[PDB]
Design an enzyme around this catalytic site. Structure first.
Site, PDB file in Angstrom:
ATOM      1  CD  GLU A  85      -3.010  -1.097   2.252  1.00  0.00           C
ATOM      2  OE1 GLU A  85      -3.274   0.029   2.710  1.00  0.00           O
ATOM      3  OE2 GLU A  85      -3.727  -2.094   2.493  1.00  0.00           O
TER       4      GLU A  85
HETATM    5 MG   LIG Z   1      -4.774   4.078   1.633  1.00  0.00          MG
END
Ligand SMILES: [Mg+2]
Ligand SMILES: [Cl-]
Ligand SMILES: [Cl-]
Ligand SMILES: [Mg+2]
Ligand SMILES: [Mg+2]
Ligand SMILES: [Mg+2]
Ligand SMILES: [Mg+2]
Length: 273
Positions: free
Chosen positions: A127
């Protein structure tokens, strides 16, 4: 369809064995290897459940096996939104692949964090950080597969398409399941908001028709507090979204973040998935 659920980041969510024993899940995603890269020792975090570095998670292998004896796949997730990771070179990717192979999969190590159980595969929950060498990593892990022992590869990209961190990895064609996070992206025209199913339905079509993986899962928050945005009330999900997306050839089911927040959600939607 099947339900996949994340587990490991909240000691209040129940044991891994209990999570599997509910009977609601076909995949449990243990989370996370929170730090890695530049050839440094990775850090594994499972909140208050146990302390990997202390050696107190080795008892988890009996729980992993209890899940596996019930035909549930148990995956180890790398990354997460709170961690700190990046790969600096192809060699760094090889180093981390070897770490995962030997410590979680069918390789061998004298310091396996979760004990002697063989995890069914690796979940890429990348991420943050640089976007480089995750294709390298996927290829290295996949090459450890045997016909007797499959290394599953799964991924959790964010809903904007293509995903900056995982597109190259996904383009290898090596991933088995992809659970797209239709949450935490409120300005990106890809997740649910009150009165708007148009964006998520359109994004689902884009993802299913543009990805090499064989099974695609609708990833959602299990409760309003499980994410910043994107939560779908269960009657909206089952009435307005599931019937349409289930017409896709590659529909695999629903992924939920996370066990802690899933006190009622999977129970309510179970027979519609
Ligand atoms: Mg995020
Ligand atoms: Cl180190
Ligand atoms: Cl956004
Ligand atoms: Mg402990
Ligand atoms: Mg493309
Ligand atoms: Mg309308
Ligand atoms: Mg489709």
């Amino acid at each position: 369809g099947d339900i996949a659920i994340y587990w490991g980041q909240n000691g209040g969510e129940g044991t891994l064995a209990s999570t599997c024993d509910t009977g609601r899940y076909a995949y449990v995603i243990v989370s996370f290897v929170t730090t890695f890269g530049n050839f440094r020792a990775p850090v594994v975090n499972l909140a208050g459940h146990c302390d990997p570095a202390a050696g107190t998670c080795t008892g988890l292998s009996d729980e992993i096996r209890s899940c596996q004896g019930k035909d549930i796949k148990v995956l180890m997730s790398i990354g997460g939104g709170a961690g700190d990771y990046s790969l600096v070179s192809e060699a760094d990717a090889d180093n981390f692949a070897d770490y995962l192979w030997n410590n979680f999969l069918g390789g061998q190590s004298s310091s396996r964090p979760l004990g002697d159980a063989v995890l069914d595969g690796i979940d890429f929950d990348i991420e943050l950080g640089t976007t480089t060498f995750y294709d390298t990593l996927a290829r290295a892990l996949s090459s450890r597969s045997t016909q007797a022992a499959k290394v599953y590869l799964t991924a959790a990209p964010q809903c904007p398409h293509p995903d900056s961190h995982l597109d190259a990895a996904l383009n290898t064609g090596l991933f088995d399941n992809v659970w797209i996070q239709f949450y935490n992206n409120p300005l990106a025209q890809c997740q649910y908001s009150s009165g708007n199913t148009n964006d998520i339905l359109s994004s689902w079509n884009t993802w299913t028709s543009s990805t090499t993986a064989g099974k695609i899962f609708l990833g959602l928050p299990a409760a309003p507090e499980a994410a910043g945005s994107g939560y779908i009330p269960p009657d909206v999900l089952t009435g307005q979204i599931l019937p349409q997306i289930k017409t896709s050839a590659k529909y695999g089911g629903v992924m939920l973040y996370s066990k802690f927040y899933d006190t009622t959600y999977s129970t309510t939607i179970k027979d519609q998935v």
